[PDB]
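Researcher: Here's my situation. A collaborator sent me these components and asked whether they could plausibly form a single complex. I don't have experimental data yet, so a predicted model of the whole assembly would be a useful starting point for our discussion.
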Amino acid sequence: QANQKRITTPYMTKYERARVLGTRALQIAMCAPVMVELEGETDPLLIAMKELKARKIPIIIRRYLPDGSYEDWGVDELIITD
Amino acid sequence: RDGKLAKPRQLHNTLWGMVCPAETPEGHAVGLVKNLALMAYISVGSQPSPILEFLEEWSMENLEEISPAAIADATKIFVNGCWVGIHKDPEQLMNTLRKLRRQMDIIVSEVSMIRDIREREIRIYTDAGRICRPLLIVEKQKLLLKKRHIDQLKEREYNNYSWQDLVASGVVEYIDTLEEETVMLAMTPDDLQEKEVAYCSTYTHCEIHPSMILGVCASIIPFPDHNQSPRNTYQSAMGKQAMG
Amino acid sequence: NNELEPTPGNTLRQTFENQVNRILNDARDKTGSSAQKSLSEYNNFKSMVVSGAKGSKINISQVIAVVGQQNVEGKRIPFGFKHRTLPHFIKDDYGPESRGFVENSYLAGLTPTEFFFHAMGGREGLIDTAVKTAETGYIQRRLIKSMESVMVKYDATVRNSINQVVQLRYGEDGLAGESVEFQNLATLKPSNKAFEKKFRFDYTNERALRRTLQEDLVKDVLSNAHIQNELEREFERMREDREVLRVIFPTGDSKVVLPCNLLRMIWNAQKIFHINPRLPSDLHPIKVVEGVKELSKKLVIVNGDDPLSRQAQENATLLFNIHLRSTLCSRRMAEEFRLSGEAFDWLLGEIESKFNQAIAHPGEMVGALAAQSLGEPATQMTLNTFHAKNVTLGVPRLKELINISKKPKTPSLTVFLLGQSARDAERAKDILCRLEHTTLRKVTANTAIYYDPNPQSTVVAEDQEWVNVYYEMPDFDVARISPWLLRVELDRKHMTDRKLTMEQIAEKINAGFGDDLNCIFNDDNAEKLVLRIRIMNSDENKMQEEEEVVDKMDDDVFLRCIESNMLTDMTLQGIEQISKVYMHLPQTDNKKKIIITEDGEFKALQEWILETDGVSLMRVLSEKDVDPVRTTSNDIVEIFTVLGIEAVRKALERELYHVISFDGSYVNYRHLALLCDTMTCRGHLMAITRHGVNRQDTGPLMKCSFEETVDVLMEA
Amino acid sequence: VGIRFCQECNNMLYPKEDKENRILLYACRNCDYQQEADNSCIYVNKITHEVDELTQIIADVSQDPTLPRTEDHPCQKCGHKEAVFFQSHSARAEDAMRLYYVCTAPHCGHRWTE
Amino acid sequence: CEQLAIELSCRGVNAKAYHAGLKASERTLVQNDWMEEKVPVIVATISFGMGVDKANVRFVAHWNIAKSMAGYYQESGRAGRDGKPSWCRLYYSRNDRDQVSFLIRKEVAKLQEKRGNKASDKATIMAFDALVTFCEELGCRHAAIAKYFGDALPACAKGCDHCQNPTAVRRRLEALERSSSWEAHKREWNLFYQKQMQLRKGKDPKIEEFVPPDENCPLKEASSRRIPRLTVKAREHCLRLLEEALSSNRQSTRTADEADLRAKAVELEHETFRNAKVANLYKASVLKKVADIHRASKDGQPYDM
Amino acid sequence: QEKMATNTVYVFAKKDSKYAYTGECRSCLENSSRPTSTIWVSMLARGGQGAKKSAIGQRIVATLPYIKQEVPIIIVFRALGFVSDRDILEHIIYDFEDPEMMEMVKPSLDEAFVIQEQNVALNFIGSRGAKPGVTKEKRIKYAKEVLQKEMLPHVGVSDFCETKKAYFLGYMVHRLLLAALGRRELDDRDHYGNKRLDLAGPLLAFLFRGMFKNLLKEVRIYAQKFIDRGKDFNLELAIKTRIIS
Amino acid sequence: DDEEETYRLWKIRKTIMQLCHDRGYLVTQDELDQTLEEFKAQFGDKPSEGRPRRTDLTVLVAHNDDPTDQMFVFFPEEPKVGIKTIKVYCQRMQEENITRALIVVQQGMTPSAKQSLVDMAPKYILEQFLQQELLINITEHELVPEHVVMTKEEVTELLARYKLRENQLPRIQAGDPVARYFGIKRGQVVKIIRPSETAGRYITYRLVQ
Amino acid sequence: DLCKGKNICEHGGCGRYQPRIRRSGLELYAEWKHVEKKILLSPERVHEIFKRISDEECFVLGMEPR
DNA sequence: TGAAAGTACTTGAGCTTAGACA
RNA sequence: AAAGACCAGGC
DNA sequence: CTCAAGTACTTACGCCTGGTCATT
Ligand SMILES: [Zn+2]
Ligand SMILES: [Zn+2]
Ligand SMILES: [Zn+2]
């Protein structure tokens, strides 16, 4: 669907957060560039967690509606519950 | 074991003294695998030839000679399930049968005699597989175990006097489950035989010791009557797993 | 000596056992209380019990005072032998020692008979434990296999794999079951006077305002009529909410489950901001009203500006909005909570944040969660539940509900009474007799077939006094009548227990058999109740018999067949399929009548209700003086055939709640609702078995994974 | 109430109506035997089944050592102090916990209910 | 008709039907084309008493028994209009006659209800009973036919089951008796009971003869039929009993006189008749009131209304 | 190994079964041969089929081994040589002064009205066997052999034991009627007096009986194979110890 | 007795008027709440051989939206309805131009009667109601929630809102007692309003098929 | 359910009748009433019967021809 | 030695009825 | 050393 | 052309440890 008329909770679900963090950490562990500045951090999990806290993860979530349509939500657009 | 029927698995009243109440496996085999009590003995089997000959020699009536009008008052006689005839004086017949079993003249102690008074049937079983345990015989309110028997049993070494001679003296008696039906037992003589506020006076047998109801594994439990029955069962199961 | 009068609905043995068990239970309870009252504060059993770490009060009772009565299959120890428990006891000994009551405690040690009875009780417990196995595992597997694909989609609608709508919102409110807690409405079940005293915000006093509200705000509240009008509008809206609650919650149950604890959060706001209740507050009540109105808009379960969306949102948040307006009332804020402006703003922000956190996350697999949350208590439910009016409970009842059993083991039906029948016991007995199926054999002392060639001969001597008068009026005396007589004796106790009279019996006989039967009976003055029945033949020729022996069915054996039909199929009173009806005054609030008095309070009325063994709902509801609204039955299929499918949804919900909450355990309403909906949503009653899970139009791979495998794939 | 057997082939008799004399007859169906009926009743069915258990109680029951016995209730015939008592000892006995007493001592065999 | 036609066609025998809510147009064919061998076999109930009695009628079978000997012979006469030996067969069963009679009864009933008692009322019954006996009797079929017509009894040979085997047909008749002696059960019991008691009713049910009250009936609503089989004689006898009870109470209570007792008894009898529905219940209530009056007299107080 | 005691009469009642009360007796002959042949004697619930039981306790029905379906008890009694009803009743009812027992036996006597000869009763039983005999005498012989040998073998097997068989069958019916009247409680299946234990002795005996029978069968097979030549025979090569061992 | 039959007739008539009112047909208030005494006085007490012969108990009502369609209720006097009764009833329907009618059957119907009922779908629709089924108003039961029949416009709005196809909705069988109460045919949608202990009010839509 | 009650085949030609098919273990018996009876319905005969079913008829039968 | 509950198949009953008005 | 059967046992 | 009255037919059961055994 378009950027307007999006119907979905703006809060990011726990499942979306979990999969986004896992995928990002896998990417960072594959030497993907890191958006946020790290300070002596070698474990991709916590680096991805701090990216998520910094709204810098370069992933948009493809939310499939039951009718077959979909909505695109950037990670920064979604507000983290935690 | 997969069957969800719970009735066969339950502990029946008939298991007293013959099968251990506590010792049983836990799982799909609960209540279906039973361990034997300390005093329980399985009937080995015997030919009912002498019993039939004695009964014929003891009057009674063979089935071909009954008048069907005279069978209602008489009491039917069963030997190993076979209907061999009727008898008109159950008292003396049962008394003589018990006396013979006590003296082991014609009927071995393994054979059992049952008198169903209300239904007028007398059943004698000599077949194998019957479960039975020894019990002391009580005449009036006194045991037949006297001081001389115990004195001789203390002397059991180099006396050639053993349990078999005690059985042959008519003091102890082997009673199966369906003969236990017609018997009246007491816990201990020094408690239930002496006169008190009248509860019963027709005690015909007395238990050797009530702790004989337990099996092998359950007999190792110290103070098992102070325990919850599930804990006694758990210990009876775990005792087989104890190392030594 | 037969002085024991049997209680109604119970036999002599049943009431004797009930009285003995009552005495033994009273003794055990008294001994346990006596033992516990003697425990010193240093006693470690008492320490464990009061701490709740392990053990119970009955554990201490069995340790010290009395082990208690031992039961097998819910009854005292049975007579395994010929009317005796053990060979050591006399026959027909029903005393506490013979039937299993254990006088000794574990510390004292059990007697050998008591030891064996305790062994039997422990064997029963062990059998139950080893059975708490395959069948409850089967319940778990069947439930989830029915629910494994049910999911909350991204529009928050709960749908299965086919995208069919199971629930529009999860749990009917769209909230996750983790963050919700128990709360009290505080607007349900106060008196009208107390409701106004607590929620009106009376500004006329002008002195209490100066004490609760700041001096500056008092003049603003008093002077401005807009403030007063808006506050009165708020109170009117709260009264409407109170009426809505009283419609929603009969029985006056104020304990409700809601996302955020408003009272605890108000208290947190008090502590955080150092709120002093002794001082007047600076919080303007109109600011409270506006804050509540604005906050209610940001709590969104249904997203949309459509009127349908507006109504769906209002319904989804209705209960929580009512509670929010109740707790955040202006008078409550000014009187109890004393919150300040910053505290109130923080409270609104916290409410919004907590409610937003409580919203169910799309993608949550609520089907499997509900199935596992419903089957988990089944591993704690009594398999062989025993606990008259016997009702199947626990795992067997759960199997009956889940499998949609055509024939329940204990199908019952509760009856409520409208008029004076509810209050007066005589009319209650009248309704009970009109509902309980009574055949002739239930009221006949004995039946005899006599041969009476002449009716005035009267081979029975006692009848000659009264048969002659019926046999003297024109005709009906001799000729064209069967010489074979069917004489029936009626039991007076049964005759008057049902308030039945001979004329109604004769009317039923005439209706069943027509005028071709001659029915003669005594009067109520006679000490013994008799009824004479003959056969009437109109054949006046009676020559050569015309060889009627082809199927003549001679009058003797014909009368025998007629007597059998009378005794088995006369259905004198009540309706068939109703074996017996129990009548009692319920002391439990759920079965009592609750009304709203003139003061608006909830009063629970004590009225007679009827419970039946066997069920026929359509005719029971049609009977007079039977409440057509509140009369329900526990069996589910008949409600489907009678009251529809939504009634089945509600009734199945209630039955599942009863079978789960009977032990005292609690399960969130969302899982019960999800299961009941997934069963009653295709339009018919979908049982949770291979017959109904595979009847859905799902994928063959879905069906093959569950109990059918090869056959489903073969068909596909 | 009871049945009567044939006198010729020793079979079972059945009730038969006499059309001429209007008298109840029992005629065997396997032969031509016929006998007059005295009781004039055919079928008796006691639904309450209140048959006195004293007839079904056997005197030798007093020999039972497992049965309780009391000194309080004497016999009515011989006045013997000793008596053995027991309950209905039967199923389908409606609701009855009453006691049945049998007098001990030989040749008495008396049964009474209180 | 449809069931036998379908079963016979499935069994091979080219069957068909005459009536079935169809129409002359929708059967003219079935019928005509039956003469010209286009349709070999056609079934009907009573719709074949006409329609060109042809020549080559090979057989006439009765799946169910006819309505009478006259009816059976008039069906069977639609055959044998040649030298063709046409063995006409009748299928019989106890269940069938049972049904036929039950409806012949229902017909006779309705007829009498909307008419009076005629010779035909019993004529139909005894004709059907003659048919039953003929299918149940033992002997030559031609002899029974002649006996029913009163003609000379023919000692026929090779013309009926009786003359073929002197013990096989007897064995079949004996086995008929041995075939059956004496929520699904309710209808079975009702049918068995009504069928058995129809045997008790027998022939010529009739017997209504409701005699009107003669001249001076002291009965309110005397000419009433609300209670069946409550002829006026029974009613004024019950009133006689009521007046006797009232006179006994008058003697035992010493009230005014019996002149008002006449109207009092008429009122009591009318009230009892109104409260009652059937003769037996009416008598029960009448003597119940009499017993109540006697009890009141025994106690001593006057029997107030 | 646990098992029901053989040769004992038991009465049980199933809830939903066609039989209201079922009496059975698992009978074995002195342990000598055959495992067990069980005979059932039962009463049929409550209901008829248009010409039968419509009253107090109904017809008693016997279930013989190797008979395809039920057979009425009185017919079985007549097949034992007791044609007159009074003899059958005397074997069944021991005291004629009891009318309740007599009325309970009443419906069963009605069914056996038609059959009044021992030979026709045997034909009735013979026609209900595993395979109906082609001729009447074969059926009669088969039914007589079944009753004599394979029905209640513990009572007797040889010839004139038919009177003892009749007495024991009457006892079974009497126990069934006593249970129906409630004068005796139904036997409980868990009563250990009704249970026998097969120890090493009986178990190995059951094994060895069949194994030695198979050894004899193999000896016979080897003999018949080796005697068709007619030369001679030697046993030592005809016995395989491998089968038993 | 006869008084019991009079009570049955009064209860059945009252339930029929409530049913007609719930279907949108014009029913006067006094017709809804008719006392037993008022009914007995109006229709003449005893039905057995009395004034109310179960004919003249017929109810003629018209819809609130338009009076043309009307609606008409039948009380056959026959214990079972055959072809002739339904045919004469249909003849009356055609003469009176009415299209919708009910049948209140005593015990049951012949299967030719049911075949004739299902014969004419478009011309005249006839719904068979048992005598026992109408002795109570199932909609007044506490278990039965409030059912509302939605028009095609409301169904279209509902489907467009949730982007739902018809087959994706929960279903309710046409043989459901509540569905029969409102005389609903296959394809319609019912709006169910029931209270809840978590939300307070919940609305469910069930497709009729 | 609808097609089981039609014992005759009209529409189209082939006005001959239809036998009942019974299964005894793995054997199918084309039980003719009266037209040879109890002919062993060989799987070859059933294959020949099914091979001539048109695609439209089998699609109507519920099984997609492709 | 007991022992379980729902569902997919077959089969086999079982029913008043004929004329002359559109 | 694969695949079965049986037995015993733990939670 | 039913439908209630029967007969076959099908179900299942949490994980883990080990031992033996006959056949392949
Ligand atoms: Zn005779
Ligand atoms: Zn005495
Ligand atoms: Zn064809």
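Model: Some features of this prediction you could bring to your collaborator: Chains E and D do not touch (no CB pair under 8 Å). Residues 3, 19, 44-50, 64, 67, 99-100, 103-104, 106-107 of chain E lie near DNA strand I (CB under 10 Å from a C1').
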